[PDB]
Amino acid sequence: ADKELKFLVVDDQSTMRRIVRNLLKELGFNNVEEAEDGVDALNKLQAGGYGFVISDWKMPNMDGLELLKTIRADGAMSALPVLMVTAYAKKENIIAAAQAGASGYVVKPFTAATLEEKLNKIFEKLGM
Ligand code: BEF
Ligand SMILES: [Mn+2]
């Protein structure tokens, strides 16, 4: 994928945002911004230019399933890649996120290799 691809990393825990941002840097992606919940995310997205969203689920103000649904329903951003990265591991959560249009889903805790693999799977699916 294009190394200038602009990522938005959304998680309500600063530790997890730092993990994901650092992993992206190792993969050669430095154009990375952060958000703390779905509302903060949407504000950043409105500003434009984003090419990929990595999102937590459990967050105050707007949770990540609502964020994913909002993105998918909005004409300006309906095709934005959204990778869910969450501690929710139950199949009903996986099903609800998949049905809502998630591009992929990673369960926390996750290894660097898992994040790379799942990002690549999405790049290949979308021809990026
Ligand atoms: F708080 Be997240 F869904 F891991
Ligand atoms: Mn959370």
Side-chain angles (χ1 to χ4, degrees):
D2 179 3
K3 290 313 177 292
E4 294 305 310
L5 187 67
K6 188 179 198 191
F7 285 77
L8 184 64
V9 174
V10 192
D11 198 293
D12 57 334
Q13 294 181 292
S14 79
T15 292
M16 182 57 57
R17 296 196 303 274
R18 207 150 184 167
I19 288 164
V20 174
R21 175 191 278 271
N22 275 278
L23 286 167
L24 290 168
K25 174 179 165 176
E26 179 62 40
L27 299 173
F29 303 107
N30 299 290
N31 194 1
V32 176
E33 296 296 334
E34 290 178 34
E36 77 182 357
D37 62 50
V39 173
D40 190 37
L42 288 161
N43 282 335
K44 297 212 175 174
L45 293 171
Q46 168 187 19
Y50 286 89
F52 209 109
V53 176
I54 299 177
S55 189
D56 189 30
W57 187 322
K58 187 180 178 168
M59 302 182 286
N61 291 328
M62 181 188 291
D63 77 35
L65 183 63
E66 280 290 286
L67 174 63
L68 171 58
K69 290 174 176 172
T70 300
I71 288 167
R72 287 274 172 279
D74 190 302
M77 57 192 164
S78 56
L80 207 43
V82 181
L83 171 61
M84 304 303 296
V85 179
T86 174
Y88 289 133
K90 294 183 191 294
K91 304 310 182 184
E92 295 299 324
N93 285 265
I94 295 158
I95 290 170
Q99 291 294 143
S103 307
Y105 195 111
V106 171
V107 172
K108 299 175 179 178
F110 61 93
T111 60
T114 291
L115 182 69
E116 179 176 10
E117 166 175 0
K118 292 312 165 181
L119 285 170
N120 286 149
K121 179 173 183 59
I122 295 168
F123 300 149
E124 289 295 315
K125 176 68 164 178
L126 295 181
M128 299 168 65

